[PDB]
Amino acid sequence: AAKPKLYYFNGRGRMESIRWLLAAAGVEFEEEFLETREQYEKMQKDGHLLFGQVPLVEIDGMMLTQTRAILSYLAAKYNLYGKDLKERVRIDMYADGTQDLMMMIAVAPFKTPKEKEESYDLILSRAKTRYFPVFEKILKDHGEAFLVGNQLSWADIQLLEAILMVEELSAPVLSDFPLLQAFKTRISNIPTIKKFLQPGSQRKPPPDGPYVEVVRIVLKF
Template sequence: MAAKPKLHYFRGRGRMESVRWLLAAAGVEFEEEFLETREQYEKLQKDGRLLFGQVPLVEIDGMELTQTRAILSYLAAKYNLYGKDLKERVRIDMYTDGTLDLMMMVAVGAFKPPAEKEETSAKTRYFPVFEKILKDHGEDFLVGNKFSWADIQLLEAILLVEELDASVLSDFPLLKAFKTRISNIPTIKKFLQPGSQRKPPPDSHYVAVVREILQF
């Protein structure tokens, strides 16, 4: 029996959360080893396990993978969530790059003083794009009318922004229906339940631990 993927990261969302989402949506069980001290992080670096000196780090299929987008694209391809051909794959890449950009804007906000936080541009820049995509093709999923990495990550982004503004989808009826539809896929529904490996919003303790480990 193949070993479960092992995820090395902080005990929180950050760049690893999309990896957790993708594995959970694919129905893949995974283990986690949390970085809680500077010494743990330095040991990973000293042992040469962090290609560019950064986490996330994912152990899978006898490899040690770093760089978030590389990890996600490998998992999407491995679990048949990456389209049927190159044209579908590049659309998935465009959509997931967009949602990753949006989610990173929100994520870095936790590390800024309140006065420095920027208003999310989800309503004006990102969500209108996905509303138009759904309207133009009239299908249930973003690419090829088949469940893919793009759908998983868009749902993650929607829920992330809704934590900041519960009414963010009020002007996007197709995205609201999309959210309901994707949330009810059995593996995702399970991941959204209490007790799953989904991480909560970052709090002051998480921010302090990350700052201590990364020394910034």
């Protein structure tokens, strides 16, 4: 058997969504870490990071190096990638949207004070007036627990995380999205999802000052 080890910084980043999916997959995973600019260089020159970039996930003997390349491998392996091509596309179409949303968030910290300020306000508007109303309707129109084949999917997860991450900025955000709140609590109380959500987990906190710089040092921003 394999013991899923994942290298990346100590924070959200492109490794977060990977953690979630694994947790929900009901899988225990250990993990290394990245702190020094030289640490990068070692494993770099070690010959692992195909295009010389992380995240990286030692699993099945393979060394995955590209984000979405990784997620897709995972989700499919652990049957959360729909069944037929018709549905798998709905997942992806969804995942790309949330991803875009979460992405705007993970990046704003590096921006200048005026920059990150203006981008945050915007994140709310793009979530409230573009990404949330759409998901609310998907739920209302088909009235169901899940999002696609009436079964747990990586789109379900991806959405939850996205909702959580958005409330961390504005808590009363879901104020106008009923079907979602239900979705949130419904999914939150899922066994594997709850465990990962309890104070004891591998889950990481939001982007903090110390983390920003510890990043700009390992990669030389």
